[PDB]
């Protein structure tokens, strides 16, 4: 997006459209003899890591919902702890191609 803006600055819009119209089939033909697909092993998280993430619902979320019994308005603290869990959960499933 930097290069297209530089072309539009230097030679106008009718060269930016020529850049797009020369680049897009050059990409879509590069994908044609390689392919790209999904698998069942992509959606399968490993079991010991599943045991790691299940040891965090009853370590910092069940003792926090023990405070949710009387405390109301810590919903953003709730979401802070939740996204702390969600980030380390999403960290594992980016270890696949």
């Amino acid at each position: 997006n930097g290069i297209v803006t530089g072309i539009m600055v230097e030679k106008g819009p009718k060269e930016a459209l020529a850049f797009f119209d020369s680049l897009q089939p050059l990409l879509m033909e590069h994908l044609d003899p390689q392919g790209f697909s999904l698998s069942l092993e992509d959606l399968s998280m490993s079991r010991e890591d599943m045991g790691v993430i299940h040891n965090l619902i009853v370590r910092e979320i069940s003792p926090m919902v023990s405070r949710l019994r009387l405390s109301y308005e810590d919903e953003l603290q709730l979401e802070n702890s939740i996204q702390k869990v969600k980030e380390v959960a999403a960290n594992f499933m980016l270890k696949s191609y």
């Binding site: 003792p63 023990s66 405070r67 009387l70 405390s71 603290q77």
Partner: protein, 99 residues
């Protein structure tokens, strides 16, 4: 206030006081029957009603390794005026310490 009833008509009693002997007495309104009172209370109500305190989250506790300790104003027997104290909302804490 327990309700009381007449022994002749079994209707409800109405409290009524004549100051000839400085004495309270329950009277019925149905026939004519009266008798002497026993209790004192003419009426009893017990009107009704038979956390929103500030919390912090950056201080050490005693037992649990949490940041929270709810602070409210107190004036204890060994304290003086305005004093603050820190007990964590976790029931593992159970301990009240001074600054």
């Amino acid at each position: 206030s327990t309700m009381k009833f007449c022994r002749e008509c079994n209707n409800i009693l109405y409290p009524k006081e004549d100051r000839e002997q400085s004495i309270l007495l329950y009277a019925c309104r149905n026939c004519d029957h009266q008798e002497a009172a026993d209790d004192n209370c003419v009426y009893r109500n017990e009107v009704h009603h038979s956390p929103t305190l500030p919390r912090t989250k950056a201080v050490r506790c005693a037992k649990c390794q949490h940041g929270e300790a709810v602070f409210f104003q107190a004036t204890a027997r060994g304290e003086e005026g305005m004093t603050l104290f820190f007990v964590c909302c976790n029931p593992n804490c159970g301990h009240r310490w001074r600054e």
